[PDB]
mmCIF file with all atom_site columns, C-alpha atoms in Angstrom:
data_model
loop_
_atom_site.group_PDB
_atom_site.id
_atom_site.type_symbol
_atom_site.label_atom_id
_atom_site.label_alt_id
_atom_site.label_comp_id
_atom_site.label_asym_id
_atom_site.label_entity_id
_atom_site.label_seq_id
_atom_site.pdbx_PDB_ins_code
_atom_site.Cartn_x
_atom_site.Cartn_y
_atom_site.Cartn_z
_atom_site.occupancy
_atom_site.B_iso_or_equiv
_atom_site.pdbx_formal_charge
_atom_site.auth_seq_id
_atom_site.auth_comp_id
_atom_site.auth_asym_id
_atom_site.auth_atom_id
_atom_site.pdbx_PDB_model_num
ATOM 1   C CA . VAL P 1 1  ? 0.000   0.000   0.000  1.00 53.27 ? 1  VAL P CA 1
ATOM 2   C CA . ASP P 1 2  ? 2.584   2.536   1.204  1.00 54.28 ? 2  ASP P CA 1
ATOM 3   C CA . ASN P 1 3  ? 5.082   1.157   -1.317 1.00 55.45 ? 3  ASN P CA 1
ATOM 4   C CA . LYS P 1 4  ? 6.691   -2.133  -2.387 1.00 56.15 ? 4  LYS P CA 1
ATOM 5   C CA . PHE P 1 5  ? 8.122   -2.033  1.131  1.00 55.54 ? 5  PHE P CA 1
ATOM 6   C CA . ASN P 1 6  ? 4.731   -3.055  2.525  1.00 58.38 ? 6  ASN P CA 1
ATOM 7   C CA . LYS P 1 7  ? 6.082   -6.591  2.200  1.00 58.98 ? 7  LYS P CA 1
ATOM 8   C CA . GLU P 1 8  ? 9.570   -5.535  3.322  1.00 58.66 ? 8  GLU P CA 1
ATOM 9   C CA . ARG P 1 9  ? 8.251   -3.482  6.238  1.00 61.14 ? 9  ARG P CA 1
ATOM 10  C CA . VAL P 1 10 ? 6.439   -6.367  7.961  1.00 62.87 ? 10 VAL P CA 1
ATOM 11  C CA . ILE P 1 11 ? 9.683   -8.360  7.916  1.00 61.49 ? 11 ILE P CA 1
ATOM 12  C CA . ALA P 1 12 ? 11.371  -5.435  9.685  1.00 61.71 ? 12 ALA P CA 1
ATOM 13  C CA . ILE P 1 13 ? 8.530   -5.150  12.155 1.00 58.26 ? 13 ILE P CA 1
ATOM 14  C CA . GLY P 1 14 ? 8.911   -8.867  12.681 1.00 57.98 ? 14 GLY P CA 1
ATOM 15  C CA . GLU P 1 15 ? 12.635  -8.391  13.036 1.00 61.05 ? 15 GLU P CA 1
ATOM 16  C CA . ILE P 1 16 ? 12.112  -5.715  15.695 1.00 60.19 ? 16 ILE P CA 1
ATOM 17  C CA . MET P 1 17 ? 9.671   -8.065  17.405 1.00 61.66 ? 17 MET P CA 1
ATOM 18  C CA . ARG P 1 18 ? 12.242  -10.888 17.026 1.00 61.63 ? 18 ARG P CA 1
ATOM 19  C CA . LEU P 1 19 ? 14.839  -8.941  19.020 1.00 60.55 ? 19 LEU P CA 1
ATOM 20  C CA . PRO P 1 20 ? 14.470  -10.104 22.658 1.00 57.76 ? 20 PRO P CA 1
ATOM 21  C CA . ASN P 1 21 ? 16.796  -7.290  23.788 1.00 57.56 ? 21 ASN P CA 1
ATOM 22  C CA . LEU P 1 22 ? 14.570  -4.440  22.569 1.00 56.22 ? 22 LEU P CA 1
ATOM 23  C CA . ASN P 1 23 ? 12.042  -2.785  24.838 1.00 57.52 ? 23 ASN P CA 1
ATOM 24  C CA . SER P 1 24 ? 8.353   -3.027  23.858 1.00 59.36 ? 24 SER P CA 1
ATOM 25  C CA . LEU P 1 25 ? 8.285   0.744   23.613 1.00 59.53 ? 25 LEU P CA 1
ATOM 26  C CA . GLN P 1 26 ? 11.667  0.668   21.850 1.00 58.49 ? 26 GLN P CA 1
ATOM 27  C CA . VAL P 1 27 ? 10.126  -1.764  19.427 1.00 59.35 ? 27 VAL P CA 1
ATOM 28  C CA . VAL P 1 28 ? 7.201   0.551   18.958 1.00 62.19 ? 28 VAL P CA 1
ATOM 29  C CA . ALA P 1 29 ? 9.871   3.223   18.380 1.00 64.43 ? 29 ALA P CA 1
ATOM 30  C CA . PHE P 1 30 ? 11.186  1.273   15.433 1.00 68.94 ? 30 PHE P CA 1
ATOM 31  C CA . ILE P 1 31 ? 7.694   0.260   14.249 1.00 69.58 ? 31 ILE P CA 1
ATOM 32  C CA . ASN P 1 32 ? 6.642   3.920   14.429 1.00 69.37 ? 32 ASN P CA 1
ATOM 33  C CA . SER P 1 33 ? 9.692   4.773   12.315 1.00 70.68 ? 33 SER P CA 1
ATOM 34  C CA . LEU P 1 34 ? 8.672   2.209   9.688  1.00 68.58 ? 34 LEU P CA 1
ATOM 35  C CA . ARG P 1 35 ? 5.454   4.211   9.600  1.00 68.53 ? 35 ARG P CA 1
ATOM 36  C CA . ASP P 1 36 ? 7.564   7.373   9.324  1.00 67.16 ? 36 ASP P CA 1
ATOM 37  C CA . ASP P 1 37 ? 9.711   5.793   6.603  1.00 64.51 ? 37 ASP P CA 1
ATOM 38  C CA . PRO P 1 38 ? 8.786   2.407   5.107  1.00 65.32 ? 38 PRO P CA 1
ATOM 39  C CA . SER P 1 39 ? 11.698  2.713   2.682  1.00 67.65 ? 39 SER P CA 1
ATOM 40  C CA . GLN P 1 40 ? 14.091  2.859   5.605  1.00 65.43 ? 40 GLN P CA 1
ATOM 41  C CA . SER P 1 41 ? 12.106  0.307   7.608  1.00 63.23 ? 41 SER P CA 1
ATOM 42  C CA . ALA P 1 42 ? 15.335  -1.647  7.403  1.00 64.11 ? 42 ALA P CA 1
ATOM 43  C CA . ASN P 1 43 ? 17.265  1.393   8.685  1.00 64.61 ? 43 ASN P CA 1
ATOM 44  C CA . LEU P 1 44 ? 15.555  1.863   11.997 1.00 63.50 ? 44 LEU P CA 1
ATOM 45  C CA . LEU P 1 45 ? 15.215  -1.896  12.033 1.00 64.78 ? 45 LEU P CA 1
ATOM 46  C CA . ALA P 1 46 ? 18.939  -1.671  11.687 1.00 62.60 ? 46 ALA P CA 1
ATOM 47  C CA . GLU P 1 47 ? 18.824  0.686   14.648 1.00 62.08 ? 47 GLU P CA 1
ATOM 48  C CA . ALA P 1 48 ? 16.674  -1.926  16.358 1.00 60.77 ? 48 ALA P CA 1
ATOM 49  C CA . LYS P 1 49 ? 18.972  -4.833  15.732 1.00 64.00 ? 49 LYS P CA 1
ATOM 50  C CA . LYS P 1 50 ? 21.685  -2.414  16.835 1.00 64.64 ? 50 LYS P CA 1
ATOM 51  C CA . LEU P 1 51 ? 19.652  -1.489  19.920 1.00 67.49 ? 51 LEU P CA 1
ATOM 52  C CA . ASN P 1 52 ? 19.043  -5.112  20.503 1.00 67.40 ? 52 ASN P CA 1
ATOM 53  C CA . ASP P 1 53 ? 22.755  -5.457  20.177 1.00 65.60 ? 53 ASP P CA 1
ATOM 54  C CA . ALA P 1 54 ? 23.153  -2.436  22.451 1.00 67.25 ? 54 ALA P CA 1
ATOM 55  C CA . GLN P 1 55 ? 21.095  -4.154  25.142 1.00 68.01 ? 55 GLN P CA 1
ATOM 56  C CA . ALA P 1 56 ? 22.633  -7.537  24.276 1.00 67.56 ? 56 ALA P CA 1
ATOM 57  C CA . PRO P 1 57 ? 25.453  -9.074  26.334 1.00 67.30 ? 57 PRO P CA 1
ATOM 58  C CA . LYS P 1 58 ? 29.155  -8.977  25.516 1.00 67.04 ? 58 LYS P CA 1
ATOM 59  C CA . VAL Z 2 1  ? 8.682   -19.581 4.236  1.00 66.49 ? 1  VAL Z CA 1
ATOM 60  C CA . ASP Z 2 2  ? 10.747  -20.345 7.348  1.00 66.78 ? 2  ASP Z CA 1
ATOM 61  C CA . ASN Z 2 3  ? 10.541  -16.654 8.292  1.00 66.26 ? 3  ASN Z CA 1
ATOM 62  C CA . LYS Z 2 4  ? 6.746   -16.659 7.793  1.00 68.49 ? 4  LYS Z CA 1
ATOM 63  C CA . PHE Z 2 5  ? 6.282   -16.363 11.560 1.00 73.80 ? 5  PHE Z CA 1
ATOM 64  C CA . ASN Z 2 6  ? 8.680   -13.384 11.574 1.00 72.61 ? 6  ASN Z CA 1
ATOM 65  C CA . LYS Z 2 7  ? 6.812   -11.825 8.705  1.00 73.31 ? 7  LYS Z CA 1
ATOM 66  C CA . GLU Z 2 8  ? 3.598   -12.474 10.553 1.00 72.36 ? 8  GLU Z CA 1
ATOM 67  C CA . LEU Z 2 9  ? 5.140   -11.431 13.890 1.00 70.94 ? 9  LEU Z CA 1
ATOM 68  C CA . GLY Z 2 10 ? 5.927   -8.172  12.230 1.00 67.49 ? 10 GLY Z CA 1
ATOM 69  C CA . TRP Z 2 11 ? 2.592   -7.967  10.539 1.00 63.47 ? 11 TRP Z CA 1
ATOM 70  C CA . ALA Z 2 12 ? 0.385   -8.850  13.407 1.00 62.50 ? 12 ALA Z CA 1
ATOM 71  C CA . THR Z 2 13 ? 2.412   -6.228  15.307 1.00 61.74 ? 13 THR Z CA 1
ATOM 72  C CA . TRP Z 2 14 ? 1.604   -3.684  12.574 1.00 63.48 ? 14 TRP Z CA 1
ATOM 73  C CA . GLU Z 2 15 ? -2.041  -4.684  12.329 1.00 65.94 ? 15 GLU Z CA 1
ATOM 74  C CA . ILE Z 2 16 ? -2.297  -4.264  16.113 1.00 66.98 ? 16 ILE Z CA 1
ATOM 75  C CA . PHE Z 2 17 ? -0.307  -1.036  15.658 1.00 65.54 ? 17 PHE Z CA 1
ATOM 76  C CA . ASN Z 2 18 ? -2.843  0.119   13.055 1.00 63.89 ? 18 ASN Z CA 1
ATOM 77  C CA . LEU Z 2 19 ? -5.944  -0.852  15.081 1.00 61.67 ? 19 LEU Z CA 1
ATOM 78  C CA . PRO Z 2 20 ? -8.248  2.221   15.445 1.00 60.46 ? 20 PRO Z CA 1
ATOM 79  C CA . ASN Z 2 21 ? -9.290  1.542   19.095 1.00 62.48 ? 21 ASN Z CA 1
ATOM 80  C CA . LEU Z 2 22 ? -6.368  0.047   21.043 1.00 56.41 ? 22 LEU Z CA 1
ATOM 81  C CA . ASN Z 2 23 ? -4.474  2.164   23.561 1.00 57.83 ? 23 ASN Z CA 1
ATOM 82  C CA . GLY Z 2 24 ? -0.696  2.541   23.748 1.00 56.83 ? 24 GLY Z CA 1
ATOM 83  C CA . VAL Z 2 25 ? -0.676  -0.156  26.448 1.00 57.08 ? 25 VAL Z CA 1
ATOM 84  C CA . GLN Z 2 26 ? -2.825  -2.791  24.717 1.00 58.76 ? 26 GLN Z CA 1
ATOM 85  C CA . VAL Z 2 27 ? -0.882  -2.369  21.482 1.00 59.14 ? 27 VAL Z CA 1
ATOM 86  C CA . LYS Z 2 28 ? 2.346   -2.454  23.489 1.00 58.96 ? 28 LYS Z CA 1
ATOM 87  C CA . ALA Z 2 29 ? 1.015   -5.541  25.273 1.00 57.89 ? 29 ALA Z CA 1
ATOM 88  C CA . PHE Z 2 30 ? 0.128   -7.295  22.091 1.00 56.30 ? 30 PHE Z CA 1
ATOM 89  C CA . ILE Z 2 31 ? 3.609   -6.444  20.895 1.00 55.69 ? 31 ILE Z CA 1
ATOM 90  C CA . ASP Z 2 32 ? 5.009   -7.702  24.188 1.00 54.26 ? 32 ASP Z CA 1
ATOM 91  C CA . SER Z 2 33 ? 3.035   -10.905 23.781 1.00 56.84 ? 33 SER Z CA 1
ATOM 92  C CA . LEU Z 2 34 ? 4.247   -11.044 20.173 1.00 60.39 ? 34 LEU Z CA 1
ATOM 93  C CA . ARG Z 2 35 ? 7.916   -10.828 21.218 1.00 63.47 ? 35 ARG Z CA 1
ATOM 94  C CA . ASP Z 2 36 ? 7.268   -13.350 24.004 1.00 61.76 ? 36 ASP Z CA 1
ATOM 95  C CA . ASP Z 2 37 ? 5.358   -15.554 21.594 1.00 57.46 ? 37 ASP Z CA 1
ATOM 96  C CA . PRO Z 2 38 ? 5.626   -14.787 17.870 1.00 60.81 ? 38 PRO Z CA 1
ATOM 97  C CA . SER Z 2 39 ? 3.705   -17.906 16.875 1.00 56.75 ? 39 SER Z CA 1
ATOM 98  C CA . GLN Z 2 40 ? 0.885   -16.376 18.900 1.00 58.53 ? 40 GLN Z CA 1
ATOM 99  C CA . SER Z 2 41 ? 1.242   -13.083 16.960 1.00 57.09 ? 41 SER Z CA 1
ATOM 100 C CA . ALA Z 2 42 ? -1.967  -13.908 15.084 1.00 54.87 ? 42 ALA Z CA 1
ATOM 101 C CA . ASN Z 2 43 ? -3.677  -14.545 18.375 1.00 55.73 ? 43 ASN Z CA 1
ATOM 102 C CA . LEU Z 2 44 ? -2.428  -11.249 19.733 1.00 58.38 ? 44 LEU Z CA 1
ATOM 103 C CA . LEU Z 2 45 ? -3.589  -9.604  16.618 1.00 61.21 ? 45 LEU Z CA 1
ATOM 104 C CA . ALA Z 2 46 ? -6.827  -11.440 17.276 1.00 65.73 ? 46 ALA Z CA 1
ATOM 105 C CA . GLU Z 2 47 ? -6.845  -10.199 20.812 1.00 66.37 ? 47 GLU Z CA 1
ATOM 106 C CA . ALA Z 2 48 ? -6.119  -6.780  19.489 1.00 66.63 ? 48 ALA Z CA 1
ATOM 107 C CA . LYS Z 2 49 ? -8.952  -6.924  17.001 1.00 64.73 ? 49 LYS Z CA 1
ATOM 108 C CA . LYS Z 2 50 ? -11.007 -8.068  19.961 1.00 66.92 ? 50 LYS Z CA 1
ATOM 109 C CA . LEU Z 2 51 ? -9.727  -5.305  22.194 1.00 67.52 ? 51 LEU Z CA 1
ATOM 110 C CA . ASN Z 2 52 ? -10.070 -2.805  19.395 1.00 66.97 ? 52 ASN Z CA 1
ATOM 111 C CA . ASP Z 2 53 ? -13.523 -4.092  18.595 1.00 65.47 ? 53 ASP Z CA 1
ATOM 112 C CA . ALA Z 2 54 ? -14.365 -3.944  22.289 1.00 63.10 ? 54 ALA Z CA 1
ATOM 113 C CA . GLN Z 2 55 ? -13.060 -0.372  22.302 1.00 60.59 ? 55 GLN Z CA 1
ATOM 114 C CA . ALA Z 2 56 ? -14.788 0.212   18.944 1.00 61.07 ? 56 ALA Z CA 1
ATOM 115 C CA . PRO Z 2 57 ? -18.377 1.425   18.390 1.00 60.70 ? 57 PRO Z CA 1
ATOM 116 C CA . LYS Z 2 58 ? -21.405 -0.656  17.403 1.00 59.31 ? 58 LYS Z CA 1
#
């Protein structure tokens, strides 16, 4: 609907939702950004996987 | 595909995200439930549609 990223966006949303390190609100943060930019859904998702990584252990 | 659940986990999250009657908490909860149980994402989406419908007019 929004673009060809409608398909791509859900995967990112799913990816945010996959990250067990992200906060629910943080996840919403990324989801909300997909809304803001479906083209860069992967970008903030990137931020999410990064955030997940940020909250992940080392 | 193998990532169907992820795609759906992301989608159900979005569909719950896009529900016209859920509050920040219920949506966040459905997301929380989604992260906790992605296979249940449809169910959460279901719950959301139920919560949204419950919060929706008739």
